[PDB]
Amino acid sequence: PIETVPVKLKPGMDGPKVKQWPLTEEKIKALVEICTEMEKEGKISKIGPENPYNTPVFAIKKKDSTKWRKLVDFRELNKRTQDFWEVQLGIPHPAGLKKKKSVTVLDVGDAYFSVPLDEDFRKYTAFTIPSINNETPGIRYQYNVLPQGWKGSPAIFQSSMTKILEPFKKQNPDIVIYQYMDDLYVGSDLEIGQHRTKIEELRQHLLRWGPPFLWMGYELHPDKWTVQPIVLPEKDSWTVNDIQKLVGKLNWASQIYPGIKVRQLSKLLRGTKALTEVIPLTEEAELELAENREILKEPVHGVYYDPSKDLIAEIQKQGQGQWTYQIYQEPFKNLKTGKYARMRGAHTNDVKQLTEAVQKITTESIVIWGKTPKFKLPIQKETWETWWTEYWQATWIPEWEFVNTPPLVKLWYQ
Amino acid sequence: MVPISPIETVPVKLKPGMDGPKVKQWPLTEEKIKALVEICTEMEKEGKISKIGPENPYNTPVFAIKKKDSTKWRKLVDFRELNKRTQDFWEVQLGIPHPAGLKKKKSVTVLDVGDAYFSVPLDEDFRKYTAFTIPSINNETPGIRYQYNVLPQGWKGSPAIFQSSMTKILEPFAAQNPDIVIYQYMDDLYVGSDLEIGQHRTKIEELRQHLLRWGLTTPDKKHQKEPPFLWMGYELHPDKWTVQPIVLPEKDSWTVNDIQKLVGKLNWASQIYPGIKVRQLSKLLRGTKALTEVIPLTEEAELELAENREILKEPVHGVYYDPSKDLIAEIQKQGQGQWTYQIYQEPFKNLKTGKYARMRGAHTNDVKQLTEAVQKITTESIVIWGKTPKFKLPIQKETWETWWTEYWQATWIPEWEFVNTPPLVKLWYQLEKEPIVGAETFYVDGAANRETKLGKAGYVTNKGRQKVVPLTNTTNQKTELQAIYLALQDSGLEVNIVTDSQYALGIIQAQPDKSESELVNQIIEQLIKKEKVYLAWVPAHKGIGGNEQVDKLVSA
Ligand SMILES: COc1cc2nc(NC3CCN(Cc4ccc(C(N)=O)cc4)CC3)nc(Oc3c(C)cc(C#N)cc3C)c2cc1OC
Ligand SMILES: [Mg+2]
């Protein structure tokens, strides 16, 4: 790789000027050691005060590895970078990836360090290694090559990546390969016995055609990914409270499904009765409950993925390590709903569980639609922004906002 | 002649599209002109400036001023216009180190680098923008034109380029002398080490040699001021640190500016003075812009000020950081949403102190505020020490366990232990998860006429108990809360409450223990008095009896 690709920013937009957030000593030390080698290898170079831009940086330990990984929060630079039509518009997202039996994710971000970056754009990738207590000036770098986490890196490298994948793609025409940022999603239907080796056939190819974290693979099984429709209870005796919660759940479901009726169930709540009193169901209410139960069996009408609109993900904390989530573009039109439980590594840490839920949901969103959703997090901004980097293990970073008013919808996905 | 390495030039540009300044030179008196000619003639031989031709179209006005006792004339190049058109720079001097994060140094030497400042060259492609003119005597000859060759005083990029140039020069010396520390601030260089005093200057002499490698004259700081160091408003003693002398002025007619500087001193003093409160004094500023308006002090603001004076009656000092010892932070609740904390390693020896005030909001509770205080101290500690301290909190482990396991939001506080220091943070009520057997069931509802602001609120229960109260000057949301309040007032220790108010649900499910709304505070007071409360929600106008019956009674 000798000649560069001309890259410009969006019209009327300057480079990012994002403040570096504080880092612990071990992360600073790890970044210093990492960037020292990257500077020796020519990937980054020191900059002077004439560069006013900055992008935050921190260090992570990806899943099941003990060595630090440099992670740059290019979120501001990505939205200011031009929309990329490298050699063509965009590769149509593989709708078959979500249906394969097993999908392995490989960190191929090191391959970007072999392609140089446009010398006029390098100043926009400036970042700062902070010092403890501001005792020394922060170590300032900029990128000379395609950096990991930047929107333009997979686009510029797409021309190259296609050639390394074609000797394997034409050999295995049944395996779907999708690329998103620094990740390579390789999906196959063959059983897991030699899927590991078939993934290894991807590996030493990159080693032959060219890494610290390539030796690992994130194994997924999207065909076994659970979706949750809305469920109504099945009881032999209903209290006043049970019927009241059912009517509330059905009333909220009526905003999503047509024909949901609560007339015959509301007539049972006739009078001023105690909440714990058992109410026998009439046959007109049992029929009404049965018709509502079958309406909720069919999927929602007029639900499509609009690639022009953002994806939104809401998360509710359900307690006991259980978390529910819904993905949509317009309200009451869910594209996917799910539920998690038993977050390994955090039985008494809500933030760590939420951080892993965010990463799992984003992973599912990349597989299904090829982009990340905007999260609505049930957490105060000050708590989330203080701790989320401590449990982050992915190479990408989605956008998020915070919910401060307790939603009533938590009860109806419980 | 010994060769000296050239200081690397920082390339400087103007803002995109903008051109250099073209400001007319003011008329000057004959004595001011004569004085400026002598000043610029000396600086020209020093190499700071150089004469230019008439082709340079840029200009910056020059001025001549004099001081009190020094009967001298001094220059002034008004670079205000050029600074507006100069590019932005990376200001490496944003944050200032906090003394609590510094480590004890036996020896400390201060060197003056003001003469080394003029050795930093200015970008040659940028010097044309720094042109200035000295008007001639009687305007009968062409004015003397000059341009800068070094970083000009007052130019936008001079502090950033000078500091970055020094850092680049000092970088190999510090890396190869790890037993010393070098701090740069303005025209001073502070070098500290734990070597004995004889060897300490050997490093200093080697530093003067390393700086002479670029031809930098660096002698000891003239008139070596004795400890403490008056640096950034602190007093850095050899063994401890503190704030420069705080003096709260004695006054009887406090104005907007007086209390603005008063909270400024108290905020700046709260780093080491424990227990500083500024809530009642700051809330008097809320909505005033004229700094000359006088406001009478509330009796709870004079008491808060008088409490601050007794805290400030004796100077308080802090210790320096020891990486071998643990880092501990302790918090205390002070009331009215005020929190104070101390950070230390050994007891009674604070590294620093601080405070936290609650955010603005209609409803809140102590557990959220304590959590926010923990996050502020955590982020502050990462800045100063690069690590999270161990917390000692006035909340029992069982109280926190009940809080976070049942709260609808995700929350977390790092490693902490309970410290029995009243007032303790507690949960004042806990709503039931399931309906209570044997408890009376209250169906509440309220309504208000948007036109006349008249409303009704009340309940009806499974035992036949009913109440409807006519209300004046109310809203639908207020009547919905009043109905819940009535059910709590008229029920036993255990009660089931059924409402259709999503607004009331959102408030109560947030679990506040204090509110700005008096009605919400009354409900909270009733919730504290109860043994079991189960709050259930139902959709309105859905044929739900009890709810529909009381909906008719309140609809007028
Ligand atoms: C690990 O990196 C660093 C550690 C530092 N530690 C320190 N620590 C000590 C803490 C104690 N204090 C009072 C005292 C101590 C004894 C004596 C004496 N000669 O008897 C005089 C004054 C002197 C300074 N000071 C650093 O930079 C300074 C800063 C930030 C400000 C000033 C001022 N004005 C002076 C210095 C030297 C450090 C810089 C570091 O990196 C760049
Ligand atoms: Mg009503």
Short mmCIF file of C-alpha atoms in Angstrom, two decimals, chain A residues 228-230 253 256-260 290-301 303:
data_model
loop_
_atom_site.label_atom_id
_atom_site.label_comp_id
_atom_site.label_asym_id
_atom_site.label_seq_id
_atom_site.Cartn_x
_atom_site.Cartn_y
_atom_site.Cartn_z
CA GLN A 228 -40.28 -12.77 22.99
CA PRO A 229 -43.88 -12.10 21.92
CA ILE A 230 -46.32 -10.66 24.44
CA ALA A 253 -50.91 -3.99 23.73
CA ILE A 256 -49.53 -2.33 18.89
CA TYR A 257 -52.13 -4.92 17.85
CA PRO A 258 -55.58 -4.21 16.39
CA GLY A 259 -58.68 -5.89 17.75
CA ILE A 260 -57.47 -6.12 21.35
CA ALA A 290 -58.81 -16.23 24.13
CA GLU A 291 -59.25 -13.92 21.14
CA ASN A 292 -56.69 -11.47 22.55
CA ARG A 293 -54.31 -14.37 23.18
CA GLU A 294 -54.39 -15.40 19.51
CA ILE A 295 -54.05 -11.82 18.25
CA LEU A 296 -50.78 -11.60 20.20
CA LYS A 297 -49.56 -14.79 18.48
CA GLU A 298 -49.33 -13.17 15.05
CA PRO A 299 -46.52 -10.67 14.38
CA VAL A 300 -47.23 -6.95 14.19
CA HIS A 301 -48.62 -5.56 10.93
CA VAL A 303 -43.32 -3.46 10.45
#
